[PDB]
Structure formats: C-alpha cells, structure tokens
Amino acid sequence: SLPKYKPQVNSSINDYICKNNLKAPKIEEDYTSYFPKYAYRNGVGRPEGIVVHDTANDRSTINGEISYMKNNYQNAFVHAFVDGDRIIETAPTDYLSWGVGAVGNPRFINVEIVHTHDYASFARSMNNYADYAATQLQYYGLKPDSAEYDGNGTVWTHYAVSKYLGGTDHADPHGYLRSHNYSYDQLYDLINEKYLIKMGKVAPW
C-alpha cells in the first residue's frame, strides 16, 4: 500500500485533524452574474497558484462576508471562503479575482479564511482551506511549492505577495493563525499532504 505522509512541520492541530479523519464539505457555488470575468496573465484557466487570506474580522459570519463582498466587488472579491462548516466558491477559478492587488491578481486564486471561535471549528476551517487548495492544485496540474521564504511557488500568503510582489500591503494570515496556536507552515504541510493523497502518492486517512 501507500506510505503514510510524514509531516514536515509539527502540528498538534494537524494531528487532531488527521486522527479524527475530518472530512471537508463539498465545494458549493454562489456565483454572481455581475462580477467581471477576466483572464489571468497567461490566460483564462491559467492560475499560477493560490493565496491564503483571512477576513481580519472577528465578528462576521461567512454569509455576512459574502453579502458585503457582492456589494463591494469593485473594491475586492475573492474566489472562495471557508469556515468550519462550509466551502463556498464565490467566483470561478478560471478567471481572476480582485483579492490581492494588481501584481498578484493576474496570477493567483484567492481564498479567505473566515474567523472561527472554538478549537474544533478552527481545525475544520484549516482542513477545509487545505482541501480546497489541494483540489485546485490537482485540477490545474500545479504542485505545492511554498513561496513564503523565497518568493517563488504556488502557495502564497497575502503577506508574501506584499513582501515579494508588491501591489498590496496586507499581512494576513500570520497573526490570525498565531492567535489560534497554528501557523502558515502547518497549513502548508496540510495542503501538501492532502495534495499527495489526492494524487495517490500517500495513504488517505
């Protein structure tokens, strides 16, 4: 059989996710007819990676975030939102979204983490981000490569886009993940494992 993934980053939260065999919900669509449908720089259907954002909002729900975004889409919109219960895709991943400024937008799928308020719901939200991201990497034939420390790859934080590409100055998701005793590198390891499970290279949970 296939080898179990050896975690490359210690994570008691990822251990919890795996041990309890958490299952991500289905990706559901909530598209909006008036959002623009613009190409990535290499074409429609040509994303180069995916960005981790968080809503920076301790009070909102995923429904409130989506309501706000549909009203303010000319200022910002993203591809999807995840929380502890749902994965909602709000724009097709084949077209760009307005989520990470003028340099990153023509390159990357943008996904927002909605804030959660207990341990189990936070863990699920991480599992859900990672499932969605691994799914996109697989579908588009991208392999996980973290850009955090070298400015190159297919998985980016908003912070990394601000640091290496410019066009924006946000610092998500580091502070938010830290507040829940997690980190971007633990998330990345979870994306990597899930990608490898989907690609049939390591054992499913």
In this complex, which beta carbon is closest to Na ion, that of residue 17 or of residue 133?
A: 133
Q: Does residue 32 belong to the site contacting Na ion (CB under 5 A)?
A: no
Using the contact rule CB under 5 A, the part of the chain among 60-68, 92-100, 165-173, 186-194 near Na ion is: 92-100
Q: Which of 93, 97, 168, 186 binds Na ion (CB under 5 A)?
A: 93
Count of residues binding Na ion (CB under 5 A)? 6
Write down the least CB distance from residue 114 to Na ion, Å.
20
Q: Does residue 125 belong to the site contacting Na ion (CB under 5 A)?
A: no
DSSP string, the chain: -PPPP--SS--HHHHHHHHTT--PPPEEE---TTS----BTTBTT---EEEEEE---SS--HHHHHHHHHHSTTT---SEEE-SS-EEE-S-TTS--SSSHHHHTTTEEEEEEPP--SHHHHHHHHHHHHHHHHHHHHHHT----B-TTTS-SSEEEHHHIIIII-S----TTHHHHHHTT--HHHHHHHHHHHHHHHTTSS---
Q: Which of 15, 58, 150, 169 binds Na ion (CB under 5 A)?
A: 150
Q: Which of 47, 49, 144, 153 binds Na ion (CB under 5 A)?
A: 153
In this complex, which beta carbon is closest to Na ion, that of residue 30 or of residue 145?
A: 145
Q: Does residue 152 belong to the site contacting Na ion (CB under 5 A)?
A: yes
Write down the least CB distance from residue 195 to Na ion, Å.
15
* Residues near Na ion (CB under 5 A): 93, 145, 147, 150, 152-153
